[model samples]
Target: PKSMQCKVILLDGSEYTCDVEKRSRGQVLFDKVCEHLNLLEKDYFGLTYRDAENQKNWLDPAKEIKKQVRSGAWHFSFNVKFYPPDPAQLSEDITRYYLCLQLRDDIVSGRLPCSFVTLALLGSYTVQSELGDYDPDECGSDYISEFRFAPNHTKELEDKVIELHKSHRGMTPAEAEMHFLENAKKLSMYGVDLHHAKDSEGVEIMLGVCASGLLIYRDRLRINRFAWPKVLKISYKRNNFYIKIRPGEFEQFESTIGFKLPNHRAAKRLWKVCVEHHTFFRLL
Candidate 1:
């Protein structure tokens, strides 16, 4: 197999140079990059590079490694592709640490959409991992400033950091990160983004497909919820999608709720989201 030297870059501009076989799969290259970084949560992170059209693309594990390298741009980056990923796929302690780093970046950059409470909690956990104890006078200014991802919530940020830091006293950086991921993964709204649309009554509602069930919310308040067992079937046509509910023995009627999306594309996307959530959480 023909081998070529390639440079892998981290988001922080750190670079690792390595030789990769032309016939090697992307997963092999990813493994090499993880090894170089000494990352344990390898599956949570992936290798991505810019294509000819200046579009970012992930290195698919099934594709040939040579296909990813171009003439002028042979550089790739390590990044978190999925959030709240399956634990079975993560094999190492350090890999989870890297994923937490990406999650922290997302929280700081406001890329991760979540309530201020969630943001503050996650931020504090990250701070605890990076800075250890959060003494107001002892912690560095840069470290304290980095926790202020939320606008006008600097005081709350500081309090949360101090609280979480004291709560996890004597824990190593690895332990703090692991504990953070453990609590975060169980949250229904952790990686969920509400799908925007209106019902037949023209009342605006948000649909959230999560690990537990289908969540219906009006603004931030949860209005209704449908577990996978209660959902018998889901079908979409044009801009309308309907969910058929399975009635229990004690219930009188089976209810089917119809939701009208802005377009057929949106409807299909919602349907796909429902299918994926159901398949992952409900299917054995």
Candidate 2:
């Protein structure tokens, strides 16, 4: 019975206005927005907005549209979320191939916090997804150039790509993407954005959160872990990051752990990462 007009922003910063029924679901509005833009890989993107607390949130498709916005005009953006979306969820090969390309772009732009070797390996996989079986005759310099890296490492990456392709003979593009995502997800740093932090001992370390839980790494070796089930809650106060951990059977006293970050911004970023990871993995 209620309706409203809203501005839908795309990844490229373009905007379109649409009228929607307030009783409809968020995914309905998202679909309408994507339809207007004629987005091909629609599932890869989501409608996101910021709350009064300056926390970023995505519109839940399961909820009613009235829950997402006020009665009047509102603004939201259709942007990429959830890197390496599960290939099983993607019905089209072309969509999976596009996701592979986006992953390569994210790695190159430093948006994806992976090692250089990781990026190179992902690039090689991207080539396989796009071009299929790697033939020496078919995989020429052009294939190498697709890597967009130095000569020394490009050759190594190309060789590995071909080797992986050989092992994946007769596999389709979608299958290659599923294989790549599955392997990549196993990496310790997958989807993690490390921030400088220090334990109570003041030892310098990198802290990040992923789908599994909070992690503490000393240069790459993870020395500490707080699985999501083991974590009671996470919060920040000023420049300090705090995680309330569930007490173990042998524990008696306090289990809350604190880390000192460089500044408030860094702490908030870490907090946001935790929130985002929880929302995507646990809630969605």
Candidate 3:
């Protein structure tokens, strides 16, 4: 279009022309541009984002450059879906209650879920399986599952999986890992970790063990490449439980939380008497 297309008219009915240059060479073009329309009619439906000619004027173009966005010219969205509590079938134990709060923090604050905080709370017990020998990725395979929770059936999962975890409670190491895999097959069908046993050709099924006199639910063999039964050597005196993560047959108990132990200085001092003594309790 030619610059002369826009003509400005004065109150005296005189006409003027306007043109925009890189700089205001002589005067502003307000007078010439005003000639194209009645100044009082500026409130009329004239300005619109739909106009092709006016779209490029924005100094910041991120929002306009993307066309797929709808609902409005500018959009903002934030959402967080959490697992509701099921008091009918499950009780709010330390683990479940903590997981609930952790999820809340993630959704509300939009940051990393409180996995480490949950792990720290769980690691305070001094039993064999109850000891800190825990899996890093419990809810799902955040790091590597080889075995973990399925994504979908969280609240009301299959009865078989619940029964399988129950069976592992008292089963032998070999028997438990086998049971884990058996039920995990359902999970694996949908993509879960059923890797090789810790001590065998596949993953070993080492279950709970007695540390000091307390039984901890640690899986030193299950997470590692080699098979070794980790034994917790805890000495109890004056109502205090001293827990040690000693060398299993071929391996040793390792912390799953974070930051490699300070030369094995990451020992947790906890009560010999714990409210819960096993990780399977969390499965409920």
In candidate 2, stretches whose alpha carbon ends up further than 4 angstroms from where it belongs are 1-80, 83-99, 109-124, 135-143, 149-152, 163-170, 219-222
What is the descending lDDT order? Answer: 1, 2, 3
The digit string of per-residue lDDT tens for model 2 on 1-284 reads 66777787764346878877868788888888867766666755677766555444567777875675544336776655555435556666655554555455445556455655665555556566667776678666545544542223556666666555666556676776776666566555555556789888898988866666778887555568877778878899999999888877888754888899987867876886687776666644
> Positional deviation of 45 in candidate 3, in angstroms?
62
lDDT, candidates in the order shown: 0.70, 0.66, 0.26
Least accurate stretch of 10 residues (summed lDDT) in model 3? 188-197
Ten residues in a row with the worst lDDT in model 2?
144-153
Estimate the TM-score for candidate 2. Answer: 0.63
Model 2 C-alpha lDDT versus the unseen true structure: 0.66
Residue 148, candidate 3: Cα error in Å is 28
Total clashing pairs for each candidate: 3, 0, 23
- In candidate 1, what are the lDDT values of residues 1-284, reduced to their tens digit? 77877788875558988887767878887888877788765544678777665545667777876765545466788887545445434666667777776666555665455576666667667777877865668655444555554534566566666665667667778777787687567555565546777877988888877656687786565578888788989999999989888888899878888888887867876887688667766443
Name the candidate, 1 or 3, with the larger TM-score value.
1
Give Cα distance to truth, residue 31, candidate 1, Å: 9.7
Worst 10 residues of 1 by lDDT: 142-151
For model 1, the local distance difference test gives: 0.70
